[PDB]
Design a protein around this ligand. Structure first.
Ligand SMILES: NC(=O)C1=CN([C@@H]2O[C@H](COP(=O)(O)OP(=O)(O)OC[C@H]3O[C@@H](n4cnc5c(N)ncnc54)[C@H](OP(=O)(O)O)[C@@H]3O)[C@@H](O)[C@H]2O)C=CC1
Ligand SMILES: CCCCCCCCCCC[C@H](O)CC(=O)SCCNC(=O)CCNC(=O)[C@H](O)C(C)(C)COP(=O)(O)O
Ligand code: SF4
Ligand code: SF4
Ligand code: SF4
Ligand SMILES: [Zn+2]
Lengths: 231, 95, 44, 155, 144, 317, 206, 112, 342, 178, 92
């Protein structure tokens, strides 16, 4: 859409930011709990993969697949939300922060995880920028950089949230940065469900997004742009 | 109508059959070759012709956005059943 | 009339995202006074 | 009657292998997440008694998940050859079935059928965790309905 | 309330059709739970719904004893359910075919063939095309 | 006597098989799974089928291994794990040793010898890593564990095992000796390789440790020995520290109380397995020689001084 | 206009001034400066230019392009030097991105940036395995992403998409063996280039 | 043209002979340590045949890049990174070679 | 030819060779090597299997998509032979059992089963019939298996005149009953040999060379009706053969001189196991046999592949019996067996 | 807006009550007792598993599964040989070589759907202008041999004939969304 | 759900309330069947004053502006400021 110089609609931008932070919760939860499986805490993987199955059901409600969705098309998203998905997103978002509190109740403040993960893999910030580290690898070491805050793509300048940065560069600080990024992802979830705008889902340029299915059967130019946008 | 070969093979409705000396029939022993009973050629002869008063009819296959696009069929030649090329429901002028 | 997927009027409710951890157990002096006092009756 | 005793001993020796079969803590793909989702407690392995051991000497069934590249091919055949002799292979997903994407790539072996025998092809890019939990039900009934001591008897 | 949940356990023990029905549900489903019967299909599945359980646990089945001339006591799989009840069981709709039936068309199958791999009933693939290169046959008579 | 051998050795095998069943069910209910529901009435026929799968699968005869130690380590491992039960007290033991605590200590190290011979003669680099972290794990646990058993048998003056229940008739030894009890439970987790202190079986840093090349058969018989050691040291902690009320008119009431207490202790063991993350071979040795060995040397000091301060000199029998 | 993405000219004029500054500071050693639409600045330099231009962009006070994003060849076979080796930089202070291009073929290499950017220590191995572009002064330059014996750098346009080597297990040698490739179904290549002029401003002269 | 590390053909042949020296030291440790199947004389003959496959070229640029490729195969066979099957892929014992005479190439297919 | 049996291809996996072979007895060792070399060139092979699907499961990789049709079969029922033969154009017959069962004797599995397979082949009109026998088949052999195989050759010539009777010697391969039978003698810590190997002499012949020769016999147009004596490489005496096997294994080599009557008694009371036995009396009298040098009979070199020797490929197949002490010993660290000319 | 996650290291004059609180956090491991209480709270729950051969999964009406050819409501196979469904199928898994039917209409001779290929993405069911190809919500179609997941035309047609009672209800409940 | 004794044990052992917030969906998920919604028009679904020659984004992009091919200090932007501490949580 940048190469075609095409803006999506604001409903497409906010559903992109909303499901990108569902995606951020998905990758941070798999990251922390699969790292807990690599350490030896097998149980946050199970207790958080139940919630990951619930968010895969959200993915399957919005697009149709569990993982390989192919939903965020160039020029806005493919289809709409199903009716009453956002109520289930709100009902999951009420109860997920207690699960975050339970997983960091077991794992953050305890001796075993703290002794295994403090002062391990201490990266210098200048050596991290020389090695080309990015995102949570930088935010463990404490250099303040987040692409939703300093170079705002989509509609991420509209939402307001906090950037978790560490102060010692270790495994424990990177895990705490990921857990705090889940909590700030929950804050972006609350802001998206507060200010999701009405509108349409793809771009209304028929040469960029494919046209609607009701207008494809009735209008000829939609059949041309459907045909030569799909072959 | 599902026809039968002299080898007992069901003729597929496109006209595909395997020859009697063919080695590609050996995937069908102790198994079965799938042929549907509802032939798509024979499932249009049961459809009646539609007697309509329009000189140009519009067809969509029923449902609007459910079926095929809304295309327009001429009915001027009364000796020929004016068909819809997506579907095949035969139309005819009332007079 | 459209029937789009929107939040309801009045908005959605508040979402908890801050870290809320309970202060369970008790004070560390009296918890030691339980455990040292468990030794004294046990040794008696 | 001896054939009834032979078939009931065949059912008694196949009941153990259909129930307590022990898979592999594999990886390699997108499809590594859905093996972890069959481990996850919605559609569950361990309700059937399907346990992710890590060792190939202790494994009983191999869930090949996703892409099997040209570098991964001796790293798959070496592991399957060091599985002990009841060896069943599930192929999760379309890249282990016949190369779902990357069929025409330079560095994907075009399915897991080129290297090992695969006893059940479970399709999808997600096989959902219930869909190859159906796949472990169908391998479970497949090596229920296999006859080992019966064709040991009539031989 | 502990005697109320013990009465719940006694009720779900005594509600599944006597001791033989209790033992066949206990050794087929391996879950003894009772709900209302939302519909019996043409093959013999007994469909149950209990909305006090979870979203996902609330709709369940008890399968057939016979299906297409096969003993299905301990051999139960995924694709035994009819397609008209598939939408109800996998929570794609809130309407069973007892309440809201689907549209019936004249070409549709009146019996569900189940998933049929490693059976004499089996899909095997083939070309669905004719012979594109027609050969030249020799003549039946010689040159002289 | 052989009737007592068979009716003590068969139902301990049924008990450890059901311990593996309640491991899978208790870790399942901890992890929001249901556990192995589909086979048996509620799971009961799963570990019988696990033995009947793993013993009707074949083992390897690898080229790289040494075959004599390959076949002589797991026969040892099942013999020592089933032979630590024979000095265990119950009401009245199958065999009453004169000094059985040293038998428990030495033959519990000989189980690690079976693990260590598996690690060397399995002849992988992974198996050699597992053998040397068995060495480092016993470097961590053994001196600490014998100082704990010494410093509690300064309250019960002999090494006999019936003397523990005639000492613990009136009260448990949890209440005078809870700094002994917490570090003994941690040290017997380090003994029997459970998921906080499980290295050497590994499964999350290396592949299998002592049973990398050990296929079904000998891996199953190691698995038999390992969970026999789990229920064994659960019952040993149960008899030595939270030893129940002992009535000479009613030994079966005390045996039922001991078995409710031992299933509580085994649920605590699997609860600790599904509650804590896993140690390291450096930090394991580090805190079991840093945060344990001065504390258990001071507890050895205090229980040396305890027949002098409060003048309880223990009797011989 | 909600369809078109809005254009701010302030980033285009400050990138024009900064590209003028980099072409001013390196006149021997910068060939082309392109401040494109979508507001990205591309600086195309010599094959000898890469070490001091990237040392300038890493260590200069106004530049501060410390983090390297990616090292990437593209293979255009209609040039004399086929591989455009690009280096994407990133300012951690000034919030911008230089796309440095340089040209190469397979026979004139580039000095590698491992001596200044240790981010690219795996990116050099990636592009040497991927395109056949050798780099100087590397610690251990190695083919990593193709096989141990995959003869042929695959991302060149002269390489086919299917490849040359397929693998198959053979019971004859009891190992996985390589074969010359043949396919069950061919790659059905399409001709999706429409014959009409798509963009009238992007037209080549005849 | 700006050259790679070998300036001329004599220095390029010197580095070629140094790489052949390292392969000739490399082969018996590979056959002894990989649990290999081939004769060590067969391995040295295959190294000589793979050199004579590429030894019809003049340019020191492509000779030095073949030295770079052979050093990569050298370090992947010294440090045990090329396996038994990856070493044995060079022999191609699953496939008879295509017939050089015209008549069997006429018979076996449409090959020019 | 037909419109799909024509060989448009390049001789690989997805290529078509048109060699539609029903490989009877493909489940074992010679069958797994010839189904490998048949699907290497690329064909739809037809595999009738008598055992479970699990012991034939490792054959599923041996060709392209849908190129291996596994049909179960019983040896008594003629319809099971008929439905596997009747769509083919070449039938390979590798029916072999070196021991006896209760349902199948030494003679019926080599006479009456190739009688029924060639009778269904002559009823179905396939072109070539690659029946494999032993080259020591006569009427006066001491073992019963060669006496069964000679009259099986007589009856298969009676019911099939254009039948290619390929006659290998003792085939050696990775899972064989020759090399592993000679190298599993280390558990008894002695090799009881028949007259110390001084009156018997053998030619071990490689299984890929036999399978490549069977594939070239199916593809050879002028080889129909022949009788291929299929002995290849250099001729070894048995004392030097077991000396080569045990010197390459580097185990203890004490050859026990035991006579033929007592060692056949050892085989007779050793073959009573209800599983697959370690040795049998006809296996013992096939060890005590001399494979003669064949006169005017064609073999490997006129069919199109050269026989690989035992010294070139013995490290492929004898590596499964060594210890770790001498695991990495290559070809040159052992002494080759002495080659005799008689 | 940034936020620190681990920055509390300061000598803040730790007194007797907070020092005994830290020295009772260590040497009793009461936060490990807290983690034990967390797992004790989770063991007393009715678990989240379903018993899948008798209690099947939660899904969606848009859940794309097994490929199927639909049919019109009055007979007549819906596929009209457009060939835009293999120009959109990114695995190149569809061969649909066709002819005139010698009845005046337009159908296909061959369909091929490769289930050992293909991406399960719904590109074809969004490119089909008549909705002939559809992705009916099966997931219980795992086969044992590699032949049986090469769906040509007849398996696809009786698949859609098998599943037309559910697919048409999904399209009738879903066609306002797309 | 379980009864009150197990509910109070779960609430004490977690440390907070657990019947208010469940990870198990009982009735918090709405009805899976739905009324059919109406997809709205876009800002280019106009009958009048709607041209692709004014609405295009694919043809307003030109070839790239070549500056130099063959004054004070210049920065690629204003130099960015560090962010502020969060008012909800400064530390953790
Ligand atoms: N040691 C050797 O390998 C030698 C073999 N030969 C000859 O080579 C040929 C094949 O040898 P090889 O592969 O090693 O032999 P195997 O022991 O491996 O068995 C060959 C095949 O015969 C089948 N078979 C055996 N008995 C019966 C029966 N009663 N009914 C149906 N099928 C049966 C087996 O199937 P199933 O799995 O069901 O048993 C198997 O597939 C034979 O003609 C043999 O005489 C000659 C010299 C040496
Ligand atoms: C077996 C498994 C491992 C397999 C591992 C296989 C490894 C293969 C490595 C890749 C190929 C290899 O780099 C090629 C190369 O080294 S070089 C090719 C060019 N060769 C020439 O250009 C010869 C020119 N000829 C002369 O210069 C003069 O004729 C003369 C010889 C007289 C000089 O003589 P002086 O010097 O004395
Ligand atoms: S089968 Fe699909 S989901 Fe699995 S690895 Fe391949 S592309 Fe990813
Ligand atoms: S787009 Fe639809 S109707 Fe057209 S060829 Fe494909 S499946 Fe058939
Ligand atoms: S779902 Fe996607 S992958 Fe499958 S047929 Fe349709 S276009 Fe191909
Ligand atoms: Zn119509």
């Amino acid at each position: 859409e940048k190469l075609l110089n095409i803006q999506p609609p604001p409903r497409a931008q906010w559903i992109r930011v909303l499901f990108g932070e569902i995606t951020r919760i998905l990758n941070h939860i798999m990251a922390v709990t699969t790292h807990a499986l690599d350490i030896g805490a097998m149980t946050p993987f199970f207790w958080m993969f139940e919630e990951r199955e619930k968010m895969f059901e959200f993915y399957e409600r919005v697009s149709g697949a569990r993982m390989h969705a192919a939903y965020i098309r160039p020029g806005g998203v493919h289809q709409d939300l199903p009716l009453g998905l956002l109520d289930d997103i709100y009902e999951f978002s009420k109860n997920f922060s207690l699960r975050i509190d339970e997983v960091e109740e077991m794992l953050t403040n305890n001796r075993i995880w703290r002794n295994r993960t403090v002062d391990i893999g201490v990266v210098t910030a200048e050596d991290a920028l020389n090695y080309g580290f990015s995102g949570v690898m930088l935010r463990g070491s404490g250099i303040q950089w987040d692409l939703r805050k300093t170079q705002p793509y989509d509609v991420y300048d509209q939402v307001e949230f906090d950037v978790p940065i560490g102060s010692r560069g270790d495994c424990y600080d990177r895990y705490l940065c990921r857990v705090e990024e889940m909590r700030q992802s929950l804050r972006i979830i609350e802001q998206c469900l507060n200010k999701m705008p009405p509108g349409e889902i793809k771009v209304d340029d028929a040469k960029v997004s494919p046209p609607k299915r009701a207008e494809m059967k009735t209008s000829m130019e939609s059949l041309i742009h459907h045909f030569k946008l799909y072959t | 109508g599902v026809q039968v070969s002299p080898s007992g093979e069901k003729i597929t409705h496109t006209g595909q059959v395997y020859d009697e000396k063919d080695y590609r029939r050996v995937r069908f022993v102790d198994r079965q070759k799938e042929v549907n009973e509802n032939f798509a050629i024979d499932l249009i002869a049961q459809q009646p012709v539609n007697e309509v008063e329009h000189r140009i009819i519009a067809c969509d296959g029923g449902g609007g956005a459910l079926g095929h696009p809304k295309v327009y069929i001429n009915l001027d030649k009364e000796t020929k059943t004016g068909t819809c090329g997506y579907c095949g429901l035969q139309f005819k002028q009332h007079h | 009339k459209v029937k789009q997927d929107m939040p309801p009027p009045g908005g959605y409710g508040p979402i908890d995202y801050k870290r809320n951890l309970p202060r369970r157990g008790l004070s560390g002096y009296s918890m030691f006074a339980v455990g040292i006092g468990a030794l004294i009756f046990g040794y008696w | 009657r001896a054939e009834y005793v032979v078939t009931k001993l065949d059912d008694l020796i196949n009941w153990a292998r259909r129930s307590s079969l022990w898979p592999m803590t594999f990886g390699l793909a997108c499809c590594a997440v859905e093996m972890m989702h069959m481990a996850a407690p919605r559609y569950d392995m361990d309700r059937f008694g399907v346990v992710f051991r890590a060792s190939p000497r202790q494994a009983d069934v191999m869930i090949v998940a996703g892409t099997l590249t040209n570098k991964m091919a001796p790293a798959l055949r070496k592991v399957y050859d060091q599985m002990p002799e009841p060896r069943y292979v599930v192929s999760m997903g379309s890249c282990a079935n016949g190369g779902g994407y990357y069929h025409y790539s330079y560095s994907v072996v075009r399915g897991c059928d080129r290297i090992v025998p695969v006893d059940i092809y479970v399709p999808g890019c997600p096989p959902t965790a219930e869909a190859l939990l159906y796949g472990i039900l169908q391998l479970q009934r497949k090596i229920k309905r296999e006859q080992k001591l019966k064709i040991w008897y009539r031989r | 309330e502990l005697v109320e949940v013990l009465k719940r356990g006694v009720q779900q023990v005594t509600g599944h059709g006597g001791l033989r029905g209790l033992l066949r549900v206990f050794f087929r489903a391996n879950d003894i739970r009772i709900g209302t019967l939302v519909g019996e299909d043409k093959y013999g599945n007994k469909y149950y719904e209990d909305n006090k359980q979870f979203f996902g646990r609330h709709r369940w089945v008890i399968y057939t004893t016979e299906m297409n001339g096969k003993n299905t006591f301990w051999d139960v799989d995924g694709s035994m359910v009819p397609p008209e009840w598939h939408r109800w069981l996998h929570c794609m709709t809130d309407d069973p075919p007892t309440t809201n039936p689907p549209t019936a068309r004249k070409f549709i199958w009146t019996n569900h063939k189940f998933n049929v791999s490693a059976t004499p009933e089996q899909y095997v693939p083939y070309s669905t095309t004719r012979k594109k290169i027609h050969e030249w046959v020799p003549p039946s008579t010689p040159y002289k | 006597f052989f009737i007592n051998i068979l009716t003590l050795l068969v139902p301990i095998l049924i008990a450890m098989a059901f311990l593996t069943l309640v491991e899978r069910k208790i870790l399942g209910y901890m992890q929001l799974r249901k556990g192995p529901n589909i086979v048996g009435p509620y799971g009961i026929l799963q570990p019988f089928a696990d033995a009947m799968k793993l013993f009707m699968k074949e083992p390897m005869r690898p080229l790289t291994t040494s075959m004599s130690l390959f076949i002589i380590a797991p026969t040892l491992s099942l013999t020592l794990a089933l032979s630590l039960w024979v000095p265990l007290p119950m009401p009245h033991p199958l065999i009453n040793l004169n000094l059985g605590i040293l038998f428990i200590l030495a033959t519990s190290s000989l189980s690690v010898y079976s693990i260590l011979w598996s690690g060397w003669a399995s002849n992988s680099k992974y198996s050699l890593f597992g053998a040397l972290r068995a060495v480092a794990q016993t470097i961590s646990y053994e001196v600490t564990m014998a100082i704990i058993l010494l410093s509690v048998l300064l309250m019960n003056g002999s090494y006999s095992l019936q003397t523990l229940i005639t000492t613990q008739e009136h009260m448990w030894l949890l209440l005078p000796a809870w700094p002994m009890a917490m570090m003994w439970f941690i040290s017997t987790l380090a003994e029997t390789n459970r998921a906080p202190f499980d290295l050497t079986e590994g499964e999350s840093e290396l592949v299998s440790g002592f049973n990398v090349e050990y296929a079904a058969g000998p891996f199953a018989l190691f698995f038999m020995a390992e969970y026999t050691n789990i229920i064994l040291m659960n019952a040993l902690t149960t008899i030595i520290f939270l030893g129940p009320l002992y009535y000479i008119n009613l030994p079966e009431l005390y045996s039922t109380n001991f078995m409710m207490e031992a299933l509580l202790l085994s649920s605590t063991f699997l609860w600790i397995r599904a509650s804590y993350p896993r140690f390291r071979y450096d930090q394991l040795m580090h805190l079991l020689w840093k945060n344990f060995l001065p504390l258990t040397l001071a507890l050895c000091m205090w229980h040396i001084s305890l027949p002098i301060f409060t003048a309880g000199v223990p009797p011989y029998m | 206009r909600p369809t078109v993405r809005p254009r701010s000219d302030v980033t285009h004029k400050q990138l024009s001034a900064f590209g003028e500054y980099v072409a001013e500071i390196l006149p021997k050693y910068v060939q082309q400066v392109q401040v494109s639409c979508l507001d990205e600045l591309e600086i195309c330099i010599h094959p000898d230019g890469v070490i001091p231009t990237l040392t300038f962009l890493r260590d200069h006070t106004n530049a501060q392009f410390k983090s390297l994003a990616d090292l990437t060849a593209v293979d255009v076979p209609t040039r004399q030097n086929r591989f455009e080796i690009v280096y994407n930089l990133l300012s951690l202070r000034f919030n911008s991105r230089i796309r440095v291009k340089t040209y190469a073929d397979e026979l004139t290499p580039i000095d590698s940036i491992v001596s200044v950017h240790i981010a690219a220590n795996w990116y050099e191995r990636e592009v040497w395995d991927m395109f056949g572009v050798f780099f100087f002064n590397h610690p251990d330059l190695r083919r990593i992403l193709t096989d141990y014996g995959f003869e042929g750098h695959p991302f060149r346009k002269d390489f086919p998409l299917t490849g040359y080597v397929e693998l198959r297990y053979d019971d004859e040698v009891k190992r996985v063996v390589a074969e010359p490739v043949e396919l069950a179904q061919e790659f059905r290549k399409f001709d999706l280039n429409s014959p009409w002029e798509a963009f009238p401003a992007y037209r080549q002269p005849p | 043209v700006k050259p790679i590390f070998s300036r001329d053909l004599n220095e390029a042949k010197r580095r070629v002979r140094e790489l052949y020296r390292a392969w000739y030291r490399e082969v018996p440790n590979t056959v002894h340590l990989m649990q290999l199947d081939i004769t060590v004389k067969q391995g040295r003959d295959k190294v000589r045949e793979m050199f004579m496959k590429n030894a019809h070229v003049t340019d020191p640029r492509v000779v030095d890049l073949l030295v770079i490729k052979g050093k990569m195969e050298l370090q992947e066979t010294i440090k045990v990174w090329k396996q038994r099957t990856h070493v044995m892929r060079f022999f191609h014992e699953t496939e008879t070679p295509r017939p050089k005479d015209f008549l069997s190439k006429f018979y076996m297919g449409h090959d020019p | 030819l037909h419109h799909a049996v024509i060989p448009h291809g390049k001789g690989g996996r997805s290529s078509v060779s048109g060699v539609v072979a029903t490989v009877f007895g493909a489940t074992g060792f010679l069958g797994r090597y010839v189904v490998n070399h048949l699907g290497r060139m690329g064909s739809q092979v037809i595999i009738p299997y008598r055992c479970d699907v699990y012991d034939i499961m490792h054959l599923r990789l041996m060709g392209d998509l849908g190129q291996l049709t596994f049909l179960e079969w019983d040896a008594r029922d003629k319809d099971s032979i008929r439905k596997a033969v009747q769509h083919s154009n070449v039938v390979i017959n590798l029916i072999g059992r070196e021991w006896e069962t209760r349902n199948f004797d030494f003679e019926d599995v080599f006479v009456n089963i190739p009688r029924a397979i060639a009778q269904a082949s002559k009823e179905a009109g396939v072109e070539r019939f690659i029946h494999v026998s032993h080259l020591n088949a006569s009427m006066k052999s001491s073992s019963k298996s060669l006496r069964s195989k000679a009259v099986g050759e007589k009856e298969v010539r009676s019911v099939f005149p254009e039948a290619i009777i390929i006659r290998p010697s003792d085939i050696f391969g990775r899972e064989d009953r020759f090399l592993n039978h000679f190298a599993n003698y280390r558990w008894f810590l002695a090799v009881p040999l028949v007259s110390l190997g001084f009156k018997t002499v053998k030619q071990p012949v490689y299984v890929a060379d036999v399978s490549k020769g069977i594939v070239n016999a199916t593809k050879d147009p002028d080889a129909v009706g022949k009788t291929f004596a299929f002995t290849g490489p250099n001729r070894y005496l048995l004392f030097h053969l077991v000396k080569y096997i045990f010197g390459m294994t580097h185990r203890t080599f004490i050859p026990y001189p035991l006579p033929l009557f007592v060692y056949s008694w050892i085989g007779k009371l050793f073959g009573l196991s209800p599983f697959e036995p370690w040795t049998t009396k006809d296996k013992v009298e096939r060890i005590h046999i001399s494979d003669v040098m064949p006169t005017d009979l064609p073999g490997l070199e006129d069919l199109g592949v050269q026989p690989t020797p035992l010294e070139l490929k013995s490290i492929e197949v004898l590596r499964r019996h060594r210890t770790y002490r001498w695991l990495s010993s290559e070809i040159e660290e052992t002494k080759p067996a002495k080659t005799v000319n008689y | 807006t940034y936020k620190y996650v681990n920055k509390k290291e300061q000598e803040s004059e730790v007194d007797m009550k907070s020092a005994t609180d830290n020295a009772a956090r260590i040497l009793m491991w009461t936060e490990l007792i807290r983690g034990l209480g967390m797992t004790l709270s989770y063991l007393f729950r009715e678990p989240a598993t379903i018993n899948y051969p008798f209690e099947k999964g939660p899904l969606s009406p848009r859940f794309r599964g097994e490929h199927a050819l639909r049919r019109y409501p009055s007979g007549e196979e819906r596929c009209i040989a457009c060939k835009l469904c293999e120009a959109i199928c990114p695995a190149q898994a569809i061969t649909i070589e066709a002819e005139p039917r010698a009845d005046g209409s337009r159908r296909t001779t061959r369909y091929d759907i490769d289930m050992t290929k293909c991406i399960y993405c719904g590109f074809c069911q969004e490119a089909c202008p008549v909705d002939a190809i559809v992705e009916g919500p099966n997931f219980e179609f795992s086969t044992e041999t590699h032949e049986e997941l090469l769906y040509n035309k007849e398996k696809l047609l009786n698949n859609g004939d098998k599943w037309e009672a559910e697919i048409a209800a999904n399209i009738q409940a879903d066609y306002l969304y797309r | 759900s379980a009864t009150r004794v197990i509910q109070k044990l779960r609430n004490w052992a977690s440390g907070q309330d657990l019947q208010a917030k469940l990870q198990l969906r009982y009735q918090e998920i709405a009805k899976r069947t739905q009324p059919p919604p109406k997809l709205p028009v876009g800002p280019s679904h106009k009958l009048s004053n709607n041209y692709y020659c004014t609405r295009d984004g694919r043809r307003e992009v030109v070839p790239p502006s070549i500056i130099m091919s063959s004054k004070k200090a210049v920065t690629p932007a204003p130099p960015m400021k560090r962010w502020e501490l969060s008012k909800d949580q400064p530390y953790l």
